[PDB]
């Protein structure tokens, strides 16, 4: 059970946005809390990562990129979880102090990606998604986005990824289920893409609509996010 012993142990506890649920919902109110939460969650995604099984294999640059590349898609996924486990997919549980409704979904001008994300959370329930299945699916996602130029140490990565999936074969132990899980893992990317698009654009227009970006998130959005959007850095899909 070791591999799960790990993931359970290292699983970061849910973090808050510090958002003001007394103040009215507005676009700028909402989107200065999701950039702060993103940075907060990222800080938990770094810790989490470093302690993963065999992740200190990799060239420190590949360690770093892969996180910046897979950061959005992960966050969604544990929101996929958090929304499902806490609110039964009626609402989005980005955090305890920033659970999203339809009004917020619209005020945030993120409505589409947001339906998509509830649908995900719905598919968490539809499909009997267990927590161990959740941890190794979430673990997997870290290794779900590469330069098609490949990595500096691409061989370690190829093999590392092979094992995290082997771990996901065993959590099921049959092939019927895999297809769906995979299929789901695959349903993360289009979203993380759409968001990445919105984020990007939002950064670009940030000075004009009164929305606050953390000195660090702007880097990732301006330097690493765009490699994804230009097609230099692709998702690894299971299907099609």
């Amino acid at each position: 059970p070791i591999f799960l012993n790990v993931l359970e142990a290292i699983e970061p506890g849910v973090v808050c946005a510090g958002h003001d649920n007394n103040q009215p919902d507005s676009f700028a109110a909402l989107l200065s809390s999701l950039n702060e939460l993103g940075e907060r969650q990222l800080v938990h995604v770094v810790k989490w990562a470093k302690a993963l099984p065999g992740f200190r294999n990799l060239h420190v640059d590949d360690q770093m990129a892969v996180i910046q590349y897979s950061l959005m898609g992960l966050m969604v996924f544990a929101m996929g979880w958090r929304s499902f486990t806490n609110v039964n997919s009626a609402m989005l549980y980005f955090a305890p102090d920033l659970v999203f409704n339809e009004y917020r979904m619209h005020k945030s001008r993120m409505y589409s990606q947001c339906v998509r994300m509830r649908h995900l959370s719905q598919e968490f329930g539809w499909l009997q998604i267990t927590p161990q299945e959740f941890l190794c699916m979430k673990a997997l996602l870290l290794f779900s986005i590469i330069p098609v130029d490949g990595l500096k140490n691409q061989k370690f990565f190829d093999e590392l990824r092979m094992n995290y999936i082997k771990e996901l074969d065993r959590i099921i132990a049959c092939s019927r289920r895999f297809y769906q899980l995979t299929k789901l893992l695959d349903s993360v990317q289009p979203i993380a893409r759409e968001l990445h698009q919105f984020t990007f654009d939002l950064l670009i227009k940030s000075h004009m609509v009164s929305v606050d970006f953390p000195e660090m998130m702007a880097e990732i959005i301006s330097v690493q996010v765009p490699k994804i959007l230009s097609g230099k850095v692709k998702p690894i899909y299971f299907h099609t």
Partner: peptide, 8 residues
């Protein structure tokens, strides 16, 4: 160099 590589 970069802020994300610094923190790491």
């Amino acid at each position: 160099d970069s802020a994300f590589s610094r923190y790491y």
